[PDB]
């Protein structure tokens, strides 16, 4: 593997996703694949659909083999059913050889191929235990780690910078994508990339919630989620704190729910507070904080939408937070790394910060229930 050749291997943005070019079958068919750290299947369109240009035609691949079974995957607000097979895949921006992997080819779906997408499948990079129909279906990254002789690590940089593609470095860390220190937080549970959130701070003030409220369902790092998603009680506390700290006198209730845009003539970002998320260090007595500036949560659409949404379920660190950071998914060492992204800059200003260490003596030793 060549990590320098992986720089700028993603196209897209937080609106419609970050996607990787993949070549599938013999002769190769080129697909555009969403990079998804919140799922564990490699699944591609196998039939024509309204919101896609191309699909993988298994009949045109001489190396494709059918496993003889289907899989149905269901999400909140969507689903698909596909045939499960095996074929050879190359990733041209990083590798020089092909690898044998499992592939699901989608023949029916609901709410999956959304309006506006440039991708026609998904690359699930989470752990085997989320794979469907079961964890015996070898995941793409498990196949790649073995067959390509790479370390069990990948890293991601998203350069949309709250509006320039990105990089998926399969097998390691590219030094040219960050400056300063990488801070590591333990993976609490290897399914999603579940990490432990200790504290949220808005404009320098703590929310003063029990730290279990940040982890109750789970806190995860998910490149296939657009917004920062917060459990309802955390969301309401954040909204209250943003409205108190902001130099805008009035926000509508509809602004916070995404029903109304906030509009100005000639930049709103100086009128909003920084938002900080504190993560436990590998030493449990230390934490570090990842900080997003208003640029990452007051999103241009000049009119602006709120870049945070309430969750029925989990606390999700999605693409818009990830647009601030080089994120290292260190599966081998059971940890997630963060460094501030040099590309996370708008109008000459960094849109994110990282700092530490801070003491965890005032917080419980386990914030997951």
């Amino acid at each position, epitope marked *: 593997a060549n990590f320098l050749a992986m720089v700028d291997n993603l196209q897209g943005d937080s609106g419609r996703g970050y996607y990787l070019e993949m070549l599938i079958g013999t002769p190769p068919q080129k697909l555009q694949i969403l990079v998804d750290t919140g799922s564990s299947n490699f699944a591609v369109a196998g039939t024509p659909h309204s919101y896609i240009d191309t699909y993988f035609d298994t009949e045109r691949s001489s*190396t494709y*083999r059918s*496993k*003889g*079974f289907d899989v149905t995957v269901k999400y909140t607000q969507g689903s698909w059913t596909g045939f499960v097979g*095996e074929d*050879l895949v190359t990733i041209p921006k990083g590798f020089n050889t*092909s*690898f*044998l*992997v*499992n592939i699901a080819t989608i023949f029916e779906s609901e709410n999956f191929f959304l309006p506006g997408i440039k991708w026609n499948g998904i690359l699930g990079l989470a*752990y*085997a235990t989320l*794979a469907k129909p079961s*964890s*015996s*279906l*070898e*995941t793409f990254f*498990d*196949s790649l780690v*073995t*067959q*390509a*002789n790479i370390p069990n690590v990948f890293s991601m940089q998203m350069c949309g910078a709250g509006l320039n593609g990105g990089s998926l470095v399969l097998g390691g860390i590219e030094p040219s994508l960050y400056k300063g220190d990488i801070w590591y937080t333990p993976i609490k549970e290897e399914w999603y990339y579940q990490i432990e959130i200790l504290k949220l701070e808005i404009g320098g003030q703590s929310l003063n919630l029990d730290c279990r409220e940040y982890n109750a369902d789970k806190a995860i790092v998910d490149s296939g989620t657009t917004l920062l998603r917060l459990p309802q009680k955390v969301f309401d506390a954040v909204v209250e704190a943003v409205a108190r700290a902001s130099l805008i006198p009035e926000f509508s209730d509809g602004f916070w729910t995404g029903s109304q845009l906030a509009c100005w003539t000639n930049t709103p970002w100086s009128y909003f507070p920084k938002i900080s998320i504190y993560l436990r260090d590998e030493n449990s007595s230390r934490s570090f904080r990842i900080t997003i500036l208003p640029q990452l949560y007051i999103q241009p659409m000049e009119c602006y939408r709120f870049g945070i949404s309430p969750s029925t379920n989990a606390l999700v660190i999605g693409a818009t937070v990830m647009e601030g950071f080089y994120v290292i998914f260190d599966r081998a060492q059971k940890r997630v790394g963060f460094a501030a992204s040099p590309c996370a800059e708008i109008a000459g200003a960094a849109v994110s910060e990282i700092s530490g260490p801070f003491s965890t003596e005032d917080v419980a030793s386990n914030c997951v229930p």
Partner: nanobody
Amino acid sequence: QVQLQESGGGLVQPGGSLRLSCAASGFTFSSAIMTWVRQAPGKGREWVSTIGSDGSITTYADSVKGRFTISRDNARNTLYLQMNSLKPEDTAVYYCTSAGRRGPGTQVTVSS
């Protein structure tokens, strides 16, 4: 729960041969991609060969092409590696892996 157990290694001279086996249980072997990897002390992990579930698609590292042959018997839940024309630099623990799990491996030593 998944079990992989390799056997068939040994100590051979240069130009010798071995037949490695891996017995599998606790999953549907007939639907599993299977891979052989090798690891020698002080060296990097080295992919050897992969075989698709029906046995028809096989791939090999350049370092072993034309010398080693991967195969499987789905009815017997067994993976094989036929190793010919063995060289000192093939010395390693050889292990089978599938879906992020691995067996403990079998030692291959090639020496005069």
